[PDB]
């Protein structure tokens, strides 16, 4: 009964995504029912022009990136489409075809920004959240995609700069790539790829001793641990590991983080020889 009117309200909204006159309302009304309705992602993909419309919404704000003129209305509007794209990227029925069209390649311009304005931070996080959604599926295709697209160089920039939240989510994305064996082998293949990552991680340690973050310290340690699992990487880390990880610098902060204490403990034991 009432559900049939609700289903038709969504059906019309999806149809209303096409025309630019009716997109804004349908972008709003559908970004609210994203978790409410299950089959939104297959319907969004297989309907006409709908995925193209969201891609337009993304490119339409590219002029506001450089020079940075991103308004709050622009940011909320384009993120509501990013929310719908996350629904497509989450649903298993559409995830692979979503990656097949290389759709996340168009959020990478947002990860290059540095503006720190609330409209840019909302864009930065919502774009990071889409990637964090893909890495949580732990699918082989996800790891194989992100490595080839050079998202790792994009993260490392956000891990050095940016907010603490942005730093955490970026490290989590890097972390999840390292957790996969293929992600590790890729990063430890060349020296330019290792050293760029390790120096990032070292500069983050010094920043954490002056600007502490509990969750950041946790995922930074986990990244160092995963690198220690690689033979040539473990060697380079015995001379490279920040001394602040070895000493008493982070002792007070980690006094109540059991999981992080154990990871750090294993890390020093892993490099032991």
């Amino acid at each position: 009964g009432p559900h049939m009117l609700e289903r038709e309200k969504i059906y019309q909204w999806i149809n209303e995504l096409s025309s630019p006159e009716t997109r804004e309302n349908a972008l709003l009304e559908l970004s609210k029912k994203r978790e409410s309705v299950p089959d939104l992602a297959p319907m969004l993909w297989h309907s006409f022009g709908t995925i193209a419309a969201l891609l337009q919404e993304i490119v339409n704000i590219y002029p506001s990136i450089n020079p940075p003129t991103l308004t709050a209305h622009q940011s909320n509007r384009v993120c509501n489409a990013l929310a719908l794209l996350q629904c497509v990227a989450s649903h298993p029925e559409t995830r692979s075809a979503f990656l097949a069209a290389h759709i996340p390649l168009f959020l990478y311009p947002f990860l290059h920004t540095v503006s720190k304005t609330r409209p840019f931070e909302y864009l930065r996080l919502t774009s990071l959240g889409v990637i964090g959604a893909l890495v949580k599926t732990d699918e082989q295709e996800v790891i194989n995609f992100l490595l080839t697209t050079e998202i790792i160089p994009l993260c490392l920039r956000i891990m050095e700069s940016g907010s603490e939240l942005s730093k955490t989510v970026a490290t989590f994305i890097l972390q999840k790539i390292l957790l996969d064996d293929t992600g590790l082998a890729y990063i430890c293949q060349t020296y330019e790829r290792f050293s760029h990552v390790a120096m990032i991680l070292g500069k983050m340690v010094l920043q954490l001793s002056k600007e502490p973050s509990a969750r950041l310290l946790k995922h930074v340690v986990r990244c160092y641990l995963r690198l220690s699992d690689n033979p040539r990487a473990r060697e380079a880390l015995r001379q490279c590991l920040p001394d602040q990880l070895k000493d008493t610098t982070f002792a007070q902060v980690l006094k109540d983080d059991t999981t992080t204490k154990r990871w750090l403990a294993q890390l020093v034991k892993n490099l032991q020889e």
């Binding site: 909320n76 909302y122 996080l125 964090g132 969750r215």
Partner: peptide
């Protein structure tokens, strides 16, 4: 933007853990 910014922050907090 405020509401959406906040709820997005809570969401990212769960995700990384």
């Amino acid at each position: 933007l405020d509401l959406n910014f906040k709820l997005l922050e809570e969401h990212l907090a769960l995700l990384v853990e």
